Design a binder for this molecule. Structure first.
Ligand SMILES: *[C@@H]1O[C@H](CO)[C@@H](O[C@@H]2O[C@H](CO)[C@@H](O)[C@H](O)[C@H]2NC(C)=O)[C@H](O)[C@H]1NC(C)=O
Ligand SMILES: CC(=O)N[C@@H]1[C@@H](O)[C@H](O)[C@@H](CO)O[C@H]1O
Ligand SMILES: CC(=O)N[C@@H]1[C@@H](O)[C@H](O)[C@@H](CO)O[C@H]1O
Ligand SMILES: CC(=O)N[C@@H]1[C@@H](O)[C@H](O)[C@@H](CO)O[C@H]1O
Ligand SMILES: CC(=O)N[C@@H]1[C@@H](O)[C@H](O)[C@@H](CO)O[C@H]1O
Ligand SMILES: CC(=O)N[C@@H]1[C@@H](O)[C@H](O)[C@@H](CO)O[C@H]1O
Ligand SMILES: CC(=O)N[C@@H]1[C@@H](O)[C@H](O)[C@@H](CO)O[C@H]1O
Ligand SMILES: CC(=O)N[C@@H]1[C@@H](O)[C@H](O)[C@@H](CO)O[C@H]1O
Ligand SMILES: *[C@@H]1O[C@H](CO)[C@@H](O)[C@H](O)[C@H]1NC(C)=O
Ligand SMILES: *[C@@H]1O[C@H](CO)[C@@H](O)[C@H](O)[C@H]1NC(C)=O
Ligand SMILES: *[C@@H]1O[C@H](CO)[C@@H](O)[C@H](O)[C@H]1NC(C)=O
Ligand SMILES: *[C@@H]1O[C@H](CO)[C@@H](O)[C@H](O)[C@H]1NC(C)=O
Ligand SMILES: *[C@@H]1O[C@H](CO)[C@@H](O)[C@H](O)[C@H]1NC(C)=O
Lengths: 49, 319, 208, 166, 148
C-alpha cells in the first residue's frame, strides 16, 4: 500500500520583528541637560505625550 | 484530550479520496487495449474527425473535448491531492473506447475486437431498432449528412455557452464553496476573545488561555466534522453518478441500448464518450422518425377464408 | 436646504490591500442616495460620524471645530488651513459663536470638489477632485490622519460657498477592489431588494 | 505588488495574508507559507520486503536516489522508463511496484497493450470458434445489525449522569 | 466488515478520551467529587461522548445508504441476470450473457456469470449487398462473406 503516516513541515529558521525607524523622541535634554531649574517652592511641570 | 476524532476525519476523507480514482477507473477503464484507427478514414462518409484524437497538441484531446475543458473552471493544513489518471490518460481511454466503437462496434466489449466496415456496423444498428438493413444503404450519404450536421450543431452549442455543463461546473463550485467555508471558519470566535491563536497565547495566562482555546477547539473540531460530513454525502451523490456513467459506458457505448429514454431521445444507434474536467460526456446518436403519413390498417387479411398475419411489420391500405 | 448624496461617501475602511475581490464589510458608512443637508454657516450635530463635502473655486472653507460644549469648559478639537501651513490642536478653547488651555495635542506643518469623513478617538479620511449641486459619481476616501486625542464629540462647526453634511450609520457595504489596489464600486446592501440580492450572492452581476 | 501608500497588509480571497509592507523601507514582501505535506510510506507487503519508498506530498525535493513528481518528491523508488500496470498508486499518472537485485520502482503506468485495428472498407473478422467462461462477481448486501444503547454508552452505570443527559 | 470494525473500535476507544474532564471514567468523577463540582465535569464527558455517537451514527447512516445501493444492485442482478438473460452489455460479466448462478457469502452475494466469448477469428472480404438479376439482395440474418 501507500500509507500516509505523518506530516512534513519546514520549521521557522529565525525570528524577525519589524517597526518604523527611530524618530520623534521626547525632549529629555530640555529637562536633564537644561541651563535653568525650578525653586523647590514652584516645581516646573512638562507634559510628555 | 478529544482523542481519535482527528484521525477519524483523515480516514473519512481518505475513503472519499481513494473512491474518486475508483470512480474514474470504473467509468473510463472498461477496455483492456488502447485501440487506434488507421490513417485511412473510409467510415462510410461519416466525419468523426471532430471527436477522434487531434495529433497537433501535447495531450491529444479531440475537438469536442477541448470545448468541454474550456467551458469549466488555502494552506491551513488543507491539501488537494492529484488524480491517479491525469487528463491525457483519461483522453487515451476516451480515444480507445471511441476508436474501438468506430472500427469494431460492440465486439470489443464482448471480448477480442472484430473489425467491420462502418456502413455494415450501421446496417446492424438500424436492424437493432427494427429498421431493415437496406434503409441504411438506400439513404447512406443522407444519413452521413444528417450525422455530420448533428455533430456540427454540438460544437456550435458547446461553443456558445457554459450553461449545458452546469452538471460539472456545479460540482467544481460546491467543492470550492466547501473549501472556502472551511477556511473562513478559522476567523470565527466561537465565544473566544480572538479568532487568532497567538493573541490568546500571548495576551492571557494558561489557566484562562486554556479555556479560551477549549472554545476555539470545540468550535474548530465541529467545523471539520461538518465539512467532512458534507463531503461524505456529496461524495455518495457523485459515487451514484460515477456508477450511472459506468453503466451507460457499459450498455450505451460498448453495446446498443434497448432501454427506452435511457440513451437520449429516440431509438438508440450508438454513442461516443468524450472526457470533461471531473466528468464525462456522451454523444448519443439516435434514429428519430420524422416525416409521416396516415394509413388505413387491419390486424389480418382473409384469402381462402383462412386468415393471414404479417411475419414482420403491419398491413396498410393506402386507400 | 437638501441634496441627494448619490453613490458617494465610500472610504477605505481599513489599511488593507486587496485586488480583484468583492469585500463585504459592516461599519460607519454613508447611506447611499440619502439627503445630505445643503448649505451655501451654522453649528451642527456630529452624531456617530460625518460625511462633509464642499464644492469650491476659491478656498473659502479652511477647517473645523469639534466637541460637546464648543464654548470652553472642556477640551475641543480645532483644525485650520492658513496661508503656507495647516494647524491641528485640542485645547479647552474659547471661540466666537460666529468664528471665521490644557493643550494635550498640537501640530503645525465650482471647480474643486473636496470630500471628508470624520469618525471616532478621532480619524480623518478624504478625497479631492476637479469638477464643473453635489455631483453624481463614485469616490474612494483614503485615510489621512489619526488623532489619539481622546476627545468626546457630539457637535461641530465650519471655519470659512456650497457644502453638504450627512451622518454615517452601521450599514453593510460590498466594496469592489480593482486591479493594482483601488476601491472602484460599492453596493449598500439595505438600499433595495436588488442590492440585498447582490449582497446575498456577493456578486455585482445577478443571474436570472 | 502595488499597495496604495496607506495600505500596510495584503489580503487574499480566503482572508489569508498574502503580502506585507515593510514599515522602514517601502517595499512589499510576498508571504508564502512554510512548506508542509503528508508523508506516504509506499511499500510492498512485509511478507516481501522492508524496503519502503517515501512520498513528500507537494514539495520541491530541496526542502526534504530521488525523483521529482507532480504529486511531490518521491524518495527511495527508482525512476523507471518501462510503463507497467499500476501496483501501488501514487498520483498524477505515476504508480510504483517492487521488481527486479530487487527495489521499489516508480513509473508512468501503462493503460495496457495498444492495438491499431485492421479496419477497411471491405474486411470483417468473424469468430470460427468461442470460449464459454465463468466470471465471479461479488456484491455486499448487508451490514452487521449493530445497536448502541446511548444511555449505557454515555452514562453507563450512572443515574447521577443520566439525570444530566435528559 | 473492516469499515464497521474500524467504526465500532473508534467509538469504543473514545469512551476512554477525556474531553477535558478530570477522568475519562465516570465513576472516578463520581467518587472524587460532590454533585455541584461533578455536573461541571460530567457535562464535559456528555458533550464529548454525544459528539462521538452523533459522529458514529452519521457514518453508519451514510454507509448503510451505500450498502443499500449495493443490495438494490444485487436484487437487480438476481432478477435480470439470474432469473432471465439480460442483453445489457458488461452488466452480467464480460462476454455475451448466457446465464448466472447465485451463491451466498457472509454479508453478501456472489454470482457465477456464464458468458459466451468470441475466441478464434479469421479475416474475410465482405460486401453490404449482392447483385444477381439487376435487383439488389441483402441477408435476412448475418452477413455476406468471401472465403477468398
Ligand atoms: C470533416 O469535417 C471537418 C469540419 O467539422 C473538416 O475540417 C475542416 O476542413 C476545412 C476544409 O474543408 C478546413 O478549412 C478547416 O480548417 C477544417 N477544420 C478543422 C477544425 O480542422 C474536415 O476536413 C472534414 N473531413 C472530411 C473527410 O470530410
Ligand atoms: C431619507 C429621506 O428623508 N428621504 C426624503 C425622500 O423620501 C423625499 O421624497 C425627498 C423629497 O425631495 O426628500 C428626501
Ligand atoms: C479654566 C479651567 O477650568 N481650567 C482647567 C482647571 O480648572 C483644571 O483643574 C485643570 C486640570 O489639569 O485643567 C484646566
Ligand atoms: C488596470 C491598470 O490600469 N493597471 C496598471 C498598469 O497598466 C500599469 O502598468 C501599472 C504600473 O505600475 O499600474 C497598474
Ligand atoms: C522608509 C523610510 O522612511 N526609510 C528611512 C531611510 O530612507 C533612512 O535612510 C533611514 C535613516 O536611518 O531611516 C528610515
Ligand atoms: C513545482 C515547482 O514550481 N518547482 C520549482 C521549480 O520549477 C524551480 O525551477 C526550482 C528552483 O530551484 O524550485 C522548485
Ligand atoms: C529512468 C531512465 O532510465 N531514464 C532513461 C533516460 O535517462 C535516458 O536519457 C533515455 C534515453 O532514451 O531513456 C530513459
Ligand atoms: C472447430 C474447432 O476448431 N474447435 C476447437 C476444439 O477442437 C478445441 O478443443 C477447443 C479448445 O477449447 O477450441 C475449439
Ligand atoms: C544629554 O542628556 C541625556 C539625558 O537623556 C544624556 O543621555 C546624554 O548623555 C547627555 N549628554 C551630554 C553631553 O550632557
Ligand atoms: C497660521 O495661524 C497660526 C495661529 O493658529 C499662527 O501662529 C501661524 O503663524 C499662521 N501661519 C503663518 C505662516 O503665519
Ligand atoms: C460623551 O458625551 C455624552 C453626552 O452626549 C456623555 O454621556 C458621555 O459620557 C461622554 N463620554 C466621554 C468619554 O466623555
Ligand atoms: C508471511 O507470508 C507467508 C506466505 O508467503 C505466510 O505463510 C506467513 O504466515 C506470513 N506472515 C506474516 C507475519 O504475515
Ligand atoms: C487480419 O489482418 C491482419 C493484417 O491487417 C493480420 O495481421 C491478422 O492476423 C488477420 N487476422 C486473422 C484472424 O487472420
Amino acid at each position: 500500500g501507500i500509507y500516509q503516516t505523518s506530516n512534513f513541515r519546514v520549521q521557522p529558521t529565525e525570528s524577525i520583528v519589524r517597526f518604523p525607524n527611530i524618530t520623534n523622541l521626547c525632549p529629555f535634554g530640555e529637562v536633564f541637560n537644561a541651563t535653568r531649574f525650578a525653586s523647590v517652592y514652584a516645581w516646573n511641570r512638562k507634559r510628555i505625550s | 484530550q478529544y482523542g481519535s476524532f482527528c484521525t477519524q476525519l483523515n480516514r473519512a476523507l481518505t475513503g472519499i479520496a481513494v473512491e474518486q480514482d475508483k470512480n474514474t477507473q470504473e467509468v473510463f477503464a472498461q477496455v483492456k487495449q488502447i485501440y487506434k484507427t488507421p490513417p485511412i478514414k473510409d467510415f462510410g462518409g461519416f466525419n468523426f474527425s471532430q471527436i477522434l484524437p487531434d495529433p497537433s497538441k501535447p495531450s491529444k484531446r479531440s475537438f469536442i473535448e477541448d470545448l468541454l475543458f474550456n467551458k469549466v473552471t488555502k494552506f491551513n493544513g488543507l491539501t488537494v491531492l492529484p488524480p491517479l489518471l491525469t487528463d491525457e490518460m483519461i483522453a487515451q481511454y476516451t480515444s480507445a473506447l471511441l476508436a474501438g466503437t468506430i472500427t469494431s462496434g460492440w465486439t470489443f466489449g464482448a471480448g477480442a475486437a472484430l473489425q467491420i466496415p462502418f456502413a455494415m456496423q450501421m446496417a446492424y444498428r438500424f436492424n437493432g431498432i427494427g429498421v431493415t438493413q437496406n434503409v441504411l444503404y438506400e439513404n447512406q450519404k443522407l444519413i452521413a449528412n444528417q450525422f455530420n450536421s448533428a455533430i456540427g450543431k454540438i460544437q456550435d452549442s458547446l461553443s456558445s455557452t457554459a450553461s449545458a455543463l452546469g452538471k460539472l461546473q456545479d460540482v467544481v463550485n460546491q467543492n470550492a464553496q466547501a473549501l472556502n467555508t472551511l477556511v473562513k471558519q478559522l476567523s470565527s470566535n466561537f465565544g473566544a476573545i480572538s479568532s487568532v491563536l497567538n493573541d490568546i497565547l500571548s495576551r492571557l495566562d494558561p489557566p484562562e488561555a486554556e479555556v479560551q482555546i477549549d472554545r476555539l477547539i470545540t468550535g474548530r473540531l465541529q467545523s471539520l466534522q461538518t465539512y467532512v460530513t458534507q463531503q461524505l454525502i456529496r461524495a455518495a451523490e457523485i459515487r451514484a453518478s460515477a456508477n450511472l456513467a459506468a453503466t451507460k459506458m457499459s450498455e450505451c457505448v460498448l453495446g446498443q441500448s434497448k432501454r427506452v429514454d435511457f440513451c437520449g431521445k429516440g431509438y438508440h444507434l450508438m454513442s461516443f464518450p468524450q472526457s470533461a474536467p471531473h466528468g464525462v460526456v456522451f454523444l448519443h446518436v439516435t434514429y428519430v422518425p420524422a416525416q409521416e403519413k396516415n394509413f388505413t390498417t387491419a390486424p389480418a387479411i382473409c384469402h381462402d377464408g383462412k386468415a393471414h398475419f404479417p411475419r414482420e411489420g403491419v398491413f396498410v391500405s393506402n386507400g | 436646504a437638501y441634496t441627494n448624496s448619490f453613490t458617494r461617501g465610500v472610504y477605505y475602511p481599513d489599511k488593507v490591500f486587496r485586488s480583484s475581490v468583492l469585500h463585504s464589510t459592516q461599519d460607519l458608512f454613508l447611506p447611499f442616495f440619502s439627503n445630505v443637508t445643503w448649505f451655501h454657516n451654522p453649528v451642527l450635530p456630529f452624531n456617530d460620524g460625518v460625511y462633509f463635502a464642499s464644492t469650491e473655486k476659491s478656498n473659502i472653507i479652511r477647517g473645523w471645530i469639534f466637541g460637546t460644549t464648543l464654548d470652553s469648559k472642556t477640551q475641543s478639537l480645532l483644525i485650520v488651513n492658513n496661508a503656507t501651513n495647516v494647524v491641528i490642536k485640542v485645547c479647552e478653547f474659547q471661540f466666537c459663536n460666529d468664528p471665521f488651555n490644557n493643550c494635550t495635542f498640537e501640530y503645525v506643518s465650482f471647480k474643486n470638489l473636496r470630500e471628508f469623513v470624520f469618525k471616532n478617538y478621532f480619524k480623518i479620511y478624504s478625497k479631492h477632485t476637479p469638477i464643473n449641486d453635489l455631483p453624481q459619481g463614485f469616490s474612494a476616501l483614503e485615510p489621512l490622519v489619526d488623532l489619539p486625542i481622546g476627545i468626546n464629540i457630539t457637535r461641530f462647526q465650519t471655519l470659512l460657498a456650497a457644502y453638504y453634511v450627512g451622518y454615517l450609520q452601521p450599514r453593510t457595504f460590498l466594496l469592489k477592489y480593482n486591479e493594482n489596489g483601488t476601491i472602484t464600486d460599492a453596493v449598500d446592501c439595505a438600499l433595495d431588494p436588488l442590492s440585498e440580492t447582490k449582497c446575498t450572492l456577493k456578486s455585482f452581476t445577478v443571474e436570472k | 505588488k502595488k499597495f496604495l501608500p496607506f495600505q500596510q497588509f495584503g489580503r487574499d480571497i480566503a482572508d489569508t495574508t498574502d503580502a506585507v509592507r515593510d514599515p522602514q523601507t517601502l517595499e512589499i514582501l510576498d508571504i508564502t507559507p512554510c512548506s508542509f505535506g503528508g508523508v506516504s510510506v509506499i511499500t510492498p507487503g512485509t511478507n516481501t520486503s522492508n524496503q519502503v519508498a517515501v512520498l513528500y506530498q507537494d514539495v520541491n525535493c530541496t526542502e526534504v536516489n530521488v525523483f521529482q513528481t507532480r504529486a511531490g518528491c518521491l524518495i527511495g523508488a527508482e525512476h523507471v522508463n518501462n510503463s507497467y500496470e499500476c501496483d501501488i498508486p501514487i498520483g498524477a499518472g505515476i504508480c510504483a511496484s517492487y521488481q527486479t537485485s530487487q527495489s521499489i520502482i516508480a513509473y508512468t503506468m501503462s493503460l495496457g497493450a495498444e492495438n491499431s485495428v485492421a479496419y477497411s472498407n471491405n474486411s470483417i473478422a468473424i469468430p470460427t470458434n468461442f470460449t464459454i467462461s465463468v466470471t465471479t462477481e461479488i456484491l455486499p448486501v448487508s451490514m452487521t445489525k449493530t445497536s448502541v444503547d446511548c444511555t449505557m454508552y454515555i452514562c453507563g452505570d450512572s443515574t447521577e449522569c443520566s439525570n444530566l443527559l435528559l
